[PDB]
Amino acid sequence: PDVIRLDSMSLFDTGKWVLKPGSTKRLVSSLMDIKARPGWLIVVAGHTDSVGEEKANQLLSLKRAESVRDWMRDTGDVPDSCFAVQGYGESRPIATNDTPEGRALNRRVEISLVPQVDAC
């Protein structure tokens, strides 16, 4: 009974929490992974690049997790109680913040499926 980590999804432009154009294939991919594990808690964690202010990035990271939760629930018909949203702000980069490509990779959402918590 291991937690399942889905692939990271870098779906956001600077200071934005809306799902940028061309995000549908990566979203559908996570959705399918969610549909294969009915009832697992869907932990949706948002992240930011290190540009801007730490407190501002915390709120932004959480709004990004909420945008993905909202898509999965409204477009993916996943019950609302399945989700738990989390924000890491700029604290856990996956790429350098020294380049635009690196910062774009850090603007992202990570999904973990947790079986020990009942959620749906």
Q: Which residues bind Cl ion (CB under 5 A)?
A: 16-18
22 CB neighbour count, 10 Å cutoff: 8
**Residue nearest Cl ion (C-beta atom):** 16
Q: Of 63 and 73, which has the nearer Cβ to Cl ion?
A: 63
Q: Of 48 and 119, which has the nearer Cβ to Cl ion?
A: 48
Q: Of 16 and 73, which has the nearer Cβ to Cl ion?
A: 16
Please, what is the minimum distance in Å from the beta carbon of residue 52 to Cl ion?
A: 14
Please, what is the minimum distance in Å from the beta carbon of residue 18 to Cl ion?
A: 4
| Residue linked to tokens 């202010």 | 53
Please name the residue ranges forming H helices in 1-120. Answer: 24-35, 54-74, 100-106
Please, what is the minimum distance in Å from the beta carbon of residue 57 to Cl ion?
A: 14
Output the six-digit token pair for 55: 């407190």
Beta-carbon contacts of residue 76 (< 8 Å; ≥ 6 apart): 27, 31, 34, 35
